[PDB]
Amino acid sequence: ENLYFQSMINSFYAFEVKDAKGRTVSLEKYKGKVSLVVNVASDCQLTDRNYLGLKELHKEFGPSHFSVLAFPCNQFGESEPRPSKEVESFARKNYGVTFPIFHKIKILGSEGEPAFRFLVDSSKKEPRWNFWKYLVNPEGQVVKFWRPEEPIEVIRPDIAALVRQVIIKKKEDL
């Protein structure tokens, strides 16, 4: 390598992504928050349990110190066939979630969304289905991942522990 060019991209929150309406949004707005980043889908065996679980986590720990950041993707069993604006309304209509549902992305292949590839390259784990989960710390570093089969009961303790530290730091540091 060259030392000069090592570690050029260090934070998930450095990226721009499209929102569900197609507008460019910077993830810098989530800087200082804990984020659970998840690839989602509407037409999947796992859809219901995941939207319900993610809603519960966001309600408990969000929105000041924590967010769920949801990225729809159609690459896993073609489980997100509808347009991005419909996916967002699906989630809001059926679950009443208030966490962000971004534009549909690609994750696998040459055209993989750079922000999500950051998660993959950091964790060394590429999703193999809908609803893989990545924990991003206040500094934008990926510190943990979960496979879709892991229940909320084994995700919540890491979120609680990280959110606790954020709350203390916001209080104590200027």
Whole-angstrom distance, CA of residue 85 vs CA of residue 101? 9
CA distances from 57 to 16, 17, 78, 157, 158 (A): 25, 23, 26, 11, 11
Asked whether the beta carbons of 156 and 63 are under 8 A apart, the reply is no
- Tell how strand 24-26 and strand 16-18 pair up: antiparallel
Strand-pair category, 66-72 with 24-26: unpaired
Catalytic residues: 44
Domain range for residue 14? 1-174
The Cα 162–Cα 36 span in angstroms is: 11
Pair 138, 168: CB distance under 8 Å:
no
How many separate domains does the chain show?
Answer: 1
Distance CA 80, CA 42 (A): 6
Query: Which CATH number covers residue 61?
Result: 3.40.30.10
Q: Are 91 and 59 in contact (CB under 8 A)?
A: no
Experimental method: X-ray
